Design a protein around this ligand. Structure first.
Ligand SMILES: Cc1cn([C@H]2C[C@H](O)[C@@H](COP(=O)(O)OP(=O)(O)OP(=O)(O)O)O2)c(=O)[nH]c1=O
Ligand SMILES: [Mn+2]
Ligand SMILES: [Mn+2]
Ligand code: NA
Ligand code: NA
Length: 327
DNA sequence: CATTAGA
DNA sequence: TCTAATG
Protein backbone atom coordinates (compact mmCIF):
# COMPACT_ATOMS: atom_id res chain seq x y z
CA UNK A 1 0.00 0.00 0.00
CA UNK A 2 2.96 2.31 0.55
CA UNK A 3 5.78 -0.09 1.14
CA UNK A 4 5.35 -1.55 -2.25
CA UNK A 5 4.28 1.72 -3.86
CA UNK A 6 6.98 2.79 -6.35
CA UNK A 7 7.29 -0.75 -7.55
CA UNK A 8 3.65 -1.12 -8.25
CA UNK A 9 3.59 2.34 -9.61
CA UNK A 10 6.45 2.06 -12.11
CA UNK A 11 4.95 -1.36 -12.87
CA UNK A 12 1.59 0.15 -13.63
CA UNK A 13 3.22 2.97 -15.60
CA UNK A 14 5.03 0.22 -17.61
CA UNK A 15 1.99 -1.86 -18.25
CA UNK A 16 -0.13 1.03 -19.36
CA UNK A 17 2.37 2.03 -21.78
CA UNK A 18 2.44 -1.25 -23.64
CA UNK A 19 -1.22 -1.41 -23.85
CA UNK A 20 -1.75 2.03 -25.33
CA UNK A 21 1.37 3.08 -27.32
CA UNK A 22 2.12 -0.57 -28.12
CA UNK A 23 -0.20 -3.26 -29.07
CA UNK A 24 1.38 -5.63 -26.48
CA UNK A 25 -1.64 -6.92 -24.54
CA UNK A 26 0.62 -9.66 -23.13
CA UNK A 27 3.47 -7.61 -21.62
CA UNK A 28 0.82 -5.32 -20.59
CA UNK A 29 -0.92 -8.21 -18.90
CA UNK A 30 2.49 -9.19 -17.52
CA UNK A 31 3.17 -5.94 -15.67
CA UNK A 32 -0.27 -6.04 -14.13
CA UNK A 33 -0.39 -9.37 -12.43
CA UNK A 34 3.10 -8.65 -11.20
CA UNK A 35 2.10 -5.23 -10.16
CA UNK A 36 -0.77 -7.09 -8.57
CA UNK A 37 1.30 -9.52 -6.51
CA UNK A 38 4.20 -7.41 -5.33
CA UNK A 39 1.41 -5.17 -4.24
CA UNK A 40 0.07 -7.81 -1.84
CA UNK A 41 3.51 -8.75 -0.61
CA UNK A 42 3.90 -8.19 3.09
CA UNK A 43 7.27 -6.59 3.18
CA UNK A 44 9.54 -4.14 1.63
CA UNK A 45 10.84 -5.83 -1.46
CA UNK A 46 14.56 -5.37 -1.35
CA UNK A 47 15.89 -6.57 -4.61
CA UNK A 48 14.97 -8.16 -7.84
CA UNK A 49 15.73 -11.60 -6.63
CA UNK A 50 13.49 -11.22 -3.62
CA UNK A 51 10.76 -10.02 -5.88
CA UNK A 52 11.65 -12.60 -8.40
CA UNK A 53 10.46 -15.36 -6.06
CA UNK A 54 7.04 -14.11 -6.89
CA UNK A 55 4.57 -15.60 -9.18
CA UNK A 56 4.49 -13.45 -12.30
CA UNK A 57 7.87 -12.22 -11.50
CA UNK A 58 10.12 -12.81 -14.22
CA UNK A 59 13.59 -12.02 -14.89
CA UNK A 60 12.28 -9.21 -17.13
CA UNK A 61 10.51 -7.25 -14.51
CA UNK A 62 12.94 -8.15 -11.68
CA UNK A 63 15.63 -6.43 -13.56
CA UNK A 64 13.50 -3.32 -13.72
CA UNK A 65 12.89 -3.48 -10.02
CA UNK A 66 16.64 -3.44 -9.43
CA UNK A 67 17.37 -0.36 -11.52
CA UNK A 68 14.55 1.25 -9.85
CA UNK A 69 15.58 0.31 -6.40
CA UNK A 70 19.12 1.18 -7.18
CA UNK A 71 18.46 4.56 -8.87
CA UNK A 72 15.24 6.26 -7.97
CA UNK A 73 14.31 6.06 -11.66
CA UNK A 74 14.06 3.83 -14.68
CA UNK A 75 15.46 4.53 -18.23
CA UNK A 76 12.54 2.99 -19.98
CA UNK A 77 10.18 5.09 -17.92
CA UNK A 78 12.23 8.19 -18.62
CA UNK A 79 12.52 7.52 -22.34
CA UNK A 80 8.64 6.98 -22.57
CA UNK A 81 7.77 9.87 -20.36
CA UNK A 82 9.68 11.91 -23.03
CA UNK A 83 8.46 10.18 -26.24
CA UNK A 84 6.49 12.64 -28.10
CA UNK A 85 4.69 9.93 -29.98
CA UNK A 86 3.77 8.15 -26.88
CA UNK A 87 2.81 11.45 -25.30
CA UNK A 88 0.32 12.19 -27.97
CA UNK A 89 -1.29 8.86 -27.66
CA UNK A 90 -1.77 9.50 -24.00
CA UNK A 91 -3.52 12.75 -24.58
CA UNK A 92 -5.87 12.31 -27.64
CA UNK A 93 -7.13 9.59 -25.56
CA UNK A 94 -8.78 12.16 -23.31
CA UNK A 95 -11.27 13.02 -25.90
CA UNK A 96 -14.50 11.20 -25.17
CA UNK A 97 -14.54 8.83 -28.08
CA UNK A 98 -10.91 8.43 -28.71
CA UNK A 99 -9.44 5.19 -27.53
CA UNK A 100 -5.84 3.92 -28.00
CA UNK A 101 -6.74 2.46 -31.31
CA UNK A 102 -7.85 5.67 -32.78
CA UNK A 103 -5.17 7.54 -30.85
CA UNK A 104 -2.42 5.75 -32.69
CA UNK A 105 -4.09 6.09 -36.04
CA UNK A 106 -4.53 9.85 -35.58
CA UNK A 107 -1.03 10.25 -34.48
CA UNK A 108 0.19 8.41 -37.43
CA UNK A 109 -1.75 10.58 -39.76
CA UNK A 110 -0.19 13.31 -37.69
CA UNK A 111 -3.08 14.56 -35.41
CA UNK A 112 -1.08 15.10 -32.31
CA UNK A 113 -2.49 18.25 -30.87
CA UNK A 114 -6.07 19.30 -30.06
CA UNK A 115 -5.90 21.85 -32.73
CA UNK A 116 -5.02 19.06 -35.18
CA UNK A 117 -8.00 17.35 -33.93
CA UNK A 118 -9.86 20.37 -35.00
CA UNK A 119 -8.75 20.98 -38.56
CA UNK A 120 -9.66 17.43 -39.08
CA UNK A 121 -12.89 17.30 -37.40
CA UNK A 122 -13.91 15.49 -40.53
CA UNK A 123 -11.79 12.48 -39.63
CA UNK A 124 -13.76 12.25 -36.42
CA UNK A 125 -17.14 10.49 -35.82
CA UNK A 126 -20.02 12.19 -34.00
CA UNK A 127 -19.05 10.95 -30.51
CA UNK A 128 -15.53 12.32 -30.82
CA UNK A 129 -16.96 15.38 -32.39
CA UNK A 130 -18.94 16.18 -29.43
CA UNK A 131 -16.05 14.82 -27.43
CA UNK A 132 -13.76 17.40 -28.87
CA UNK A 133 -16.43 20.01 -28.68
CA UNK A 134 -16.96 19.79 -24.82
CA UNK A 135 -13.42 18.94 -24.16
CA UNK A 136 -13.07 21.51 -21.30
CA UNK A 137 -16.59 21.09 -19.85
CA UNK A 138 -16.01 17.43 -19.91
CA UNK A 139 -12.92 17.40 -17.91
CA UNK A 140 -14.54 19.42 -15.09
CA UNK A 141 -15.81 17.98 -11.76
CA UNK A 142 -19.57 18.39 -11.01
CA UNK A 143 -20.40 20.47 -7.92
CA UNK A 144 -23.00 18.66 -5.89
CA UNK A 145 -24.55 22.10 -5.62
CA UNK A 146 -25.37 21.62 -9.42
CA UNK A 147 -26.04 17.92 -9.05
CA UNK A 148 -28.91 19.01 -6.81
CA UNK A 149 -30.42 21.27 -9.50
CA UNK A 150 -29.87 18.62 -12.19
CA UNK A 151 -31.48 15.84 -10.17
CA UNK A 152 -34.21 18.20 -9.47
CA UNK A 153 -35.12 18.69 -13.08
CA UNK A 154 -34.71 15.16 -14.18
CA UNK A 155 -36.92 14.07 -11.51
CA UNK A 156 -39.62 16.38 -12.54
CA UNK A 157 -39.95 15.64 -16.10
CA UNK A 158 -39.61 11.91 -15.50
CA UNK A 159 -42.67 12.37 -13.44
CA UNK A 160 -44.47 14.69 -15.84
CA UNK A 161 -44.26 12.08 -18.47
CA UNK A 162 -45.60 9.32 -16.51
CA UNK A 163 -45.89 9.47 -12.88
CA UNK A 164 -45.33 5.78 -12.95
CA UNK A 165 -41.55 6.08 -13.59
CA UNK A 166 -39.07 5.59 -10.83
CA UNK A 167 -35.73 7.35 -10.92
CA UNK A 168 -32.53 7.35 -8.96
CA UNK A 169 -29.46 9.28 -9.47
CA UNK A 170 -26.87 6.82 -8.34
CA UNK A 171 -23.17 6.96 -7.94
CA UNK A 172 -21.17 9.10 -5.52
CA UNK A 173 -23.63 11.91 -5.67
CA UNK A 174 -26.03 9.47 -4.08
CA UNK A 175 -23.23 8.55 -1.69
CA UNK A 176 -22.90 12.19 -0.33
CA UNK A 177 -19.86 13.05 -2.60
CA UNK A 178 -19.02 16.72 -2.73
CA UNK A 179 -18.73 16.53 -6.50
CA UNK A 180 -19.37 14.19 -9.29
CA UNK A 181 -17.82 13.23 -12.57
CA UNK A 182 -21.01 12.72 -14.56
CA UNK A 183 -24.57 12.04 -13.64
CA UNK A 184 -25.91 8.42 -13.49
CA UNK A 185 -29.63 8.14 -13.59
CA UNK A 186 -31.18 4.56 -13.16
CA UNK A 187 -34.64 4.17 -14.53
CA UNK A 188 -37.32 1.55 -14.46
CA UNK A 189 -40.93 1.22 -14.73
CA UNK A 190 -43.51 -1.32 -13.66
CA UNK A 191 -44.64 -2.16 -17.04
CA UNK A 192 -40.99 -3.26 -17.65
CA UNK A 193 -39.55 -6.27 -15.96
CA UNK A 194 -37.52 -9.41 -16.85
CA UNK A 195 -40.00 -10.94 -19.27
CA UNK A 196 -42.35 -8.23 -20.66
CA UNK A 197 -40.69 -7.93 -24.03
CA UNK A 198 -39.42 -4.41 -23.87
CA UNK A 199 -41.05 -1.01 -24.52
CA UNK A 200 -38.23 0.97 -26.14
CA UNK A 201 -40.41 4.01 -26.00
CA UNK A 202 -40.02 3.71 -22.27
CA UNK A 203 -36.58 5.21 -22.53
CA UNK A 204 -37.33 7.23 -25.52
CA UNK A 205 -40.28 9.23 -24.14
CA UNK A 206 -38.18 10.48 -21.38
CA UNK A 207 -35.24 11.37 -23.44
CA UNK A 208 -37.57 13.25 -25.62
CA UNK A 209 -38.91 15.04 -22.68
CA UNK A 210 -35.47 16.09 -21.27
CA UNK A 211 -34.51 17.42 -24.65
CA UNK A 212 -37.80 19.01 -25.07
CA UNK A 213 -36.99 21.31 -22.28
CA UNK A 214 -33.30 21.69 -23.18
CA UNK A 215 -31.71 19.66 -20.53
CA UNK A 216 -30.23 17.25 -22.98
CA UNK A 217 -28.27 18.96 -25.52
CA UNK A 218 -26.71 16.22 -27.49
CA UNK A 219 -26.82 12.57 -27.97
CA UNK A 220 -23.62 10.54 -27.67
CA UNK A 221 -25.51 7.27 -27.93
CA UNK A 222 -29.05 6.30 -27.62
CA UNK A 223 -30.18 2.78 -27.63
CA UNK A 224 -33.17 0.98 -26.44
CA UNK A 225 -32.04 0.81 -22.87
CA UNK A 226 -29.05 3.01 -22.62
CA UNK A 227 -29.04 6.59 -23.57
CA UNK A 228 -25.69 8.50 -23.15
CA UNK A 229 -25.58 12.23 -23.69
CA UNK A 230 -24.69 15.78 -22.73
CA UNK A 231 -26.70 18.19 -20.57
CA UNK A 232 -26.67 21.67 -19.17
CA UNK A 233 -28.35 23.75 -16.57
CA UNK A 234 -30.00 26.77 -17.77
CA UNK A 235 -27.66 29.54 -17.83
CA UNK A 236 -29.69 31.74 -15.57
CA UNK A 237 -30.06 35.37 -16.17
CA UNK A 238 -26.83 35.66 -18.04
CA UNK A 239 -23.16 36.40 -17.21
CA UNK A 240 -22.89 32.81 -16.09
CA UNK A 241 -23.58 29.91 -18.47
CA UNK A 242 -23.30 26.36 -17.32
CA UNK A 243 -20.73 23.80 -18.38
CA UNK A 244 -21.92 20.89 -20.52
CA UNK A 245 -22.18 17.69 -18.52
CA UNK A 246 -22.09 14.09 -19.25
CA UNK A 247 -25.24 12.38 -18.42
CA UNK A 248 -26.38 8.67 -18.70
CA UNK A 249 -29.75 7.15 -18.17
CA UNK A 250 -30.67 3.41 -18.42
CA UNK A 251 -33.96 1.45 -18.45
CA UNK A 252 -34.34 -1.34 -15.96
CA UNK A 253 -36.60 -4.17 -15.59
CA UNK A 254 -38.53 -3.12 -12.57
CA UNK A 255 -37.74 -6.48 -11.10
CA UNK A 256 -34.07 -5.71 -10.92
CA UNK A 257 -33.85 -2.11 -9.89
CA UNK A 258 -32.56 -2.08 -6.26
CA UNK A 259 -29.87 -4.55 -7.03
CA UNK A 260 -28.78 -2.61 -10.03
CA UNK A 261 -29.28 0.43 -7.86
CA UNK A 262 -27.49 -1.03 -4.91
CA UNK A 263 -24.82 -1.86 -7.20
CA UNK A 264 -24.22 1.39 -9.15
CA UNK A 265 -24.30 3.20 -5.88
CA UNK A 266 -20.97 1.73 -4.86
CA UNK A 267 -18.60 2.24 -3.52
CA UNK A 268 -16.40 -0.11 -5.48
CA UNK A 269 -15.36 -1.56 -2.14
CA UNK A 270 -18.66 -1.51 -0.31
CA UNK A 271 -19.91 -3.57 -3.09
CA UNK A 272 -17.19 -6.13 -3.03
CA UNK A 273 -17.41 -6.17 0.65
CA UNK A 274 -21.06 -6.53 0.47
CA UNK A 275 -20.78 -9.23 -2.14
CA UNK A 276 -18.14 -11.07 -0.24
CA UNK A 277 -20.61 -11.23 2.59
CA UNK A 278 -23.87 -12.46 0.93
CA UNK A 279 -21.61 -15.45 0.11
CA UNK A 280 -21.07 -16.59 3.56
CA UNK A 281 -24.65 -15.71 4.23
CA UNK A 282 -25.60 -18.29 1.62
CA UNK A 283 -26.03 -16.00 -1.38
CA UNK A 284 -25.01 -14.40 -4.45
CA UNK A 285 -25.23 -10.82 -5.60
CA UNK A 286 -24.58 -9.22 -8.96
CA UNK A 287 -25.63 -6.13 -10.96
CA UNK A 288 -29.22 -7.54 -11.11
CA UNK A 289 -30.12 -10.19 -8.62
CA UNK A 290 -29.65 -12.21 -5.51
CA UNK A 291 -29.70 -15.90 -5.59
CA UNK A 292 -29.64 -18.23 -2.70
CA UNK A 293 -26.65 -20.51 -2.68
CA UNK A 294 -26.74 -24.30 -2.77
CA UNK A 295 -24.15 -26.70 -1.48
CA UNK A 296 -23.56 -28.66 -4.80
CA UNK A 297 -21.09 -25.90 -5.35
CA UNK A 298 -23.51 -23.44 -6.97
CA UNK A 299 -27.22 -22.83 -7.34
CA UNK A 300 -29.86 -20.36 -8.70
CA UNK A 301 -33.34 -18.96 -8.08
CA UNK A 302 -33.59 -15.11 -7.96
CA UNK A 303 -34.92 -13.89 -4.62
CA UNK A 304 -37.57 -10.99 -4.74
CA UNK A 305 -36.32 -7.46 -3.94
CA UNK A 306 -38.61 -4.45 -3.06
CA UNK A 307 -35.93 -2.04 -1.87
CA UNK A 308 -32.24 -1.73 -0.95
CA UNK A 309 -33.49 -3.04 2.40
CA UNK A 310 -34.64 -6.47 1.20
CA UNK A 311 -31.25 -7.03 -0.29
CA UNK A 312 -29.69 -6.15 3.09
CA UNK A 313 -32.17 -8.28 5.10
CA UNK A 314 -31.47 -11.22 2.88
CA UNK A 315 -27.85 -11.24 3.67
CA UNK A 316 -28.98 -10.09 7.06
CA UNK A 317 -26.95 -6.94 7.41
CA UNK A 318 -27.37 -3.51 8.84
CA UNK A 319 -28.98 -1.12 6.40
CA UNK A 320 -26.28 1.20 5.34
CA UNK A 321 -27.22 4.58 4.11
CA UNK A 322 -25.71 5.70 0.83
CA UNK A 323 -23.66 8.12 2.87
CA UNK A 324 -21.85 5.20 4.53
CA UNK A 325 -21.47 2.83 1.61
CA UNK A 326 -18.01 4.18 1.51
CA UNK A 327 -16.45 0.72 1.87
C1' DC B 1 -19.30 -7.31 -19.14
C1' DA B 2 -22.74 -5.64 -21.62
C1' DT B 3 -24.50 -2.23 -24.59
C1' DT B 4 -23.95 1.16 -28.82
C1' DA B 5 -21.57 3.12 -33.39
C1' DG B 6 -19.80 2.12 -37.44
C1' DA B 7 -17.77 0.26 -41.25
C1' DT C 1 -20.14 -9.22 -38.73
C1' DC C 2 -16.33 -7.70 -35.77
C1' DT C 3 -14.12 -4.30 -33.50
C1' DA C 4 -13.97 -0.10 -30.63
C1' DA C 5 -15.25 3.01 -26.84
C1' DT C 6 -17.94 3.79 -22.61
C1' DG C 7 -19.09 2.59 -18.36
C1 LIG D 1 -19.41 1.17 -9.91
C2 LIG D 1 -19.17 2.49 -9.18
C3 LIG D 1 -20.49 3.18 -9.38
O1 LIG D 1 -21.29 2.37 -8.57
C4 LIG D 1 -20.82 2.81 -10.81
C5 LIG D 1 -20.14 3.69 -11.88
O2 LIG D 1 -20.13 5.10 -11.48
P1 LIG D 1 -19.04 6.14 -12.06
O3 LIG D 1 -19.69 7.38 -12.56
O4 LIG D 1 -18.11 5.45 -13.00
O5 LIG D 1 -18.25 6.55 -10.74
P2 LIG D 1 -18.66 7.34 -9.37
O6 LIG D 1 -20.08 7.78 -9.46
O7 LIG D 1 -18.28 6.48 -8.23
O8 LIG D 1 -17.70 8.61 -9.41
P3 LIG D 1 -17.93 10.21 -9.65
O9 LIG D 1 -19.38 10.51 -9.74
O10 LIG D 1 -17.13 10.98 -8.66
O11 LIG D 1 -17.32 10.35 -11.10
O12 LIG D 1 -20.35 1.45 -10.95
MN1 LIG E 1 -20.34 9.08 -11.80
MN1 LIG F 1 -20.67 6.94 -14.70
NA1 NA G 1 8.60 -16.85 -9.88
NA1 NA H 1 -11.18 8.99 -24.70
Amino acid sequence: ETLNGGITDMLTELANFEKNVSQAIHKYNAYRKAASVIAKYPHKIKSGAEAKKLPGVGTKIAEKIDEFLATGKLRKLEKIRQDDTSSSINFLTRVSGIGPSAARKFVDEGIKTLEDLRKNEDKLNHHQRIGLKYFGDFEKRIPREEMLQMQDIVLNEVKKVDSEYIATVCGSFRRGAESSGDMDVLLTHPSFTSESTKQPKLLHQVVEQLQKVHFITDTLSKGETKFMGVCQLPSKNDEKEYPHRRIDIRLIPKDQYYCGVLYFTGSDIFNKNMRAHALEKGFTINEYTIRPLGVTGVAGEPLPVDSEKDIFDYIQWKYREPKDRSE
